[PDB]
Design a protein around this ligand. Structure first.
Ligand SMILES: CO[C@H]1C[C@@H]2CC[C@@H](C)[C@@](O)(O2)C(=O)C(=O)N2CCCC[C@H]2C(=O)O[C@H]([C@H](C)C[C@@H]2CC[C@@H](O)[C@H](OC)C2)CC(=O)[C@H](C)/C=C(\C)[C@@H](O)[C@@H](OC)C(=O)[C@H](C)C[C@H](C)/C=C/C=C/C=C/1C
Length: 137
């Protein structure tokens, strides 16, 4: 079944390679890429602050394994408990601004199939809309 690993691997290596190149996308040294769907330039949380957002998660191949923005109902996460990719992105995503981040498998759910449809060597992407921001102290 590792055969699939190669697909996730190639599509994924191509996904990041392609995504960083895709317009609106900004790539970082960590390999994390974010695209600003809507600029808000508002507030936003630190690694320890809490955030409120809505989002849709899918595979490089379009296999949607999770969603929330579809519902449009925000979810609360602590930047410290969120996926690594998300960890930095929220801190860079201003409130009111809607971004899309493409998280390298290393910064996402792992290089292994760590999920349902999420197969071996899967790169995951999510759409992140910032509705409200908290604060640790
Ligand atoms: C894992 O299983 C997932 C289930 C699915 C997997 C697929 C993804 C699409 C999703 O649907 O969650 C999903 O919505 C999701 O993961 N999201 C939503 C979008 C941003 C945050 C991200 C995510 O889960 O970040 C976080 C990320 C998944 C956790 C790990 C971060 C490090 C990274 O290396 C790991 O890779 C695997 C994943 C989890 C969160 O959503 C937010 C921030 C964290 C919580 C609310 C905390 O409750 C959680 O923090 C971990 C905790 O473990 C606390 C302490 C204790 C409680 C009882 C346990 C919660 C467990 C949550 C587990 C979750 C949701």
């Amino acid at each position: 079944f590792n055969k699939k690993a190669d697909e996730n691997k190639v599509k994924g290596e191509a996904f990041l390679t392609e995504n960083k190149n895709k317009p609106g996308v900004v790539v970082l040294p960590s390999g994390l890429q974010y695209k600003v769907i809507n600029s808000g330039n508002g507030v936003k949380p630190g690694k320890s602050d809490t955030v409120t957002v809505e989002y849709t998660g899918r595979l490089i191949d379009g296999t949607v394994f999770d969603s929330t923005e579809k519902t449009g109902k925000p979810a609360t996460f602590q930047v410290s408990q969120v996926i690594p990719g998300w960890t930095e992105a929220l801190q860079l995503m201003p409130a009111g601004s809607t971004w899309e981040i493409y998280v390298p498998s290393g910064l996402a759910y792992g290089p292994r199939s760590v999920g349902g449809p999420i197969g071996p060597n899967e790169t995951l992407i999510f759409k992140i809309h910032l509705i409200s921001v908290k604060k640790s102290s």
